Write a protein that binds this ligand. Structure first.
Ligand SMILES: O=C(O)[C@H](O)[C@H](O)[C@H](O)[C@@H](O)CO
Length: 310
């Protein structure tokens, strides 16, 4: 029961990013599993707008598939704000375990009420601080830095508490704001810093790995529900295949990215063990207040699953 369909897949990152190549890989798998009847068209690099617009496109049905960071979803479902808390996951293996486990599914299950199907989680990654004003190797260096953040009360509160002037902006506007120094800097994973070319206008990189961002791989519930079960099965099966492809490609891209940023002579700093301690204690009281905005059951449950995974 598989009829010809044309399926629109917009996203924010560059086509050459690991997740952009995973998007093409998803397109290829969907076609294979449907004998060429289901054809995914990808529109990368923000061609169909930033995350916030992609989410709305899926709700309304102008788009079929996207991947977005969890932060913008907090505007619909506050519990998704949990992943903007710093230092939640020690490594990617903890993240996978938690996201693919009951605490991750509890959140994905909140999406149909809002018109969305969370097919699964993909990896955006550990985020690192880039700027153009000065090296950031100490908590103190963050003070008064005009830092773009993702558009969520949790991101804004955390970085304001670390002393920065936190400027929420959509990702599609970020490059020009860095280039024009309307903002001093930003924080993203290395392979995004590379493939969106932020390093061209950001001479400083700090390997802070301060937050882990999941992507949600999403379908429009309106569109998905009118598929036949055989058609749904092509999508979910392709999504499981692409999740594994995406996570491997993300991790390898993270390694290639640091080399390219290094071998390209970007100035890379780290936070000391001590400075990282200072960071955690500055954020502690703010994380505690944000629980009320996120959802105390979600924060505590994610922390407990992270602990057992770890
Ligand atoms: O900095 C951000 O907003 C995010 O890390 C990503 O750029 C964003 O989730 C997506 O647009 C990526 O496709």
């Amino acid at each position: 029961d598989i009829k010809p369909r044309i399926i629109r897949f917009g996203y924010g990152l560059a086509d050459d990013s690991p997740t952009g190549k995973a998007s093409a890989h998803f397109a290829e798998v969907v076609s294979k599993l449907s004998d060429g009847k289901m054809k995914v068209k990808t529109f990368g690099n923000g061609a169909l707008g930033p995350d916030e617009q992609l989410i709305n496109s899926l709700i309304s049905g102008s788009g079929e598939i996207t991947f977005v960071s969890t932060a913008p979803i907090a505007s619909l479902i506050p519990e998704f704000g949990v992943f903007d808390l710093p230092f939640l996951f020690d490594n990617e293996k903890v993240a996978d375990t938690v996201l693919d486990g009951p605490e991750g599914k509890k959140l994905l299950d909140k999406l149909p009420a809002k018109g969305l199907i969370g097919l699964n989680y993909w990896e955006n990654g550990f985020r690192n601080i880039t700027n153009s004003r000065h090296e950031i190797s100490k908590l103190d260096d963050i003070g008064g830095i005009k830092l773009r953040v993702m558009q969520n009360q949790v991101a804004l509160s955390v970085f304001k508490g670390l002393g920065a002037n936190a400027i929420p902006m959509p990702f599609t506007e970020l490059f020009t704001a860095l280039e024009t120094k309307t903002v001093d800097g930003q924080e993203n994973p290395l392979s995004t810093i590379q493939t969106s070319k932020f390093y061209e206008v950001q001479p400083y990189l700090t390997l802070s790995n301060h937050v882990y961002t999941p992507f949600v791989f999403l379908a429009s519930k309106k569109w998905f529900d009118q598929l036949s079960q055989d058609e749904k099965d092509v999508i979910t099966q392709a999504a499981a295949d692409s999740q594994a492809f995406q996570r491997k490609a993300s991790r390898q891209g993270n390694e290639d990215a640091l080399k390219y940023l290094k071998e390209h002579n970007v100035k890379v700093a780290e936070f000391s063990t001590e400075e990282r301690e200072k960071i955690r204690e500055k954020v502690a009281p703010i994380v505690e207040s944000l629980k009320a905005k996120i959802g105390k059951e979600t924060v505590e449950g994610v922390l407990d699953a992270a602990k057992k995974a770890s």
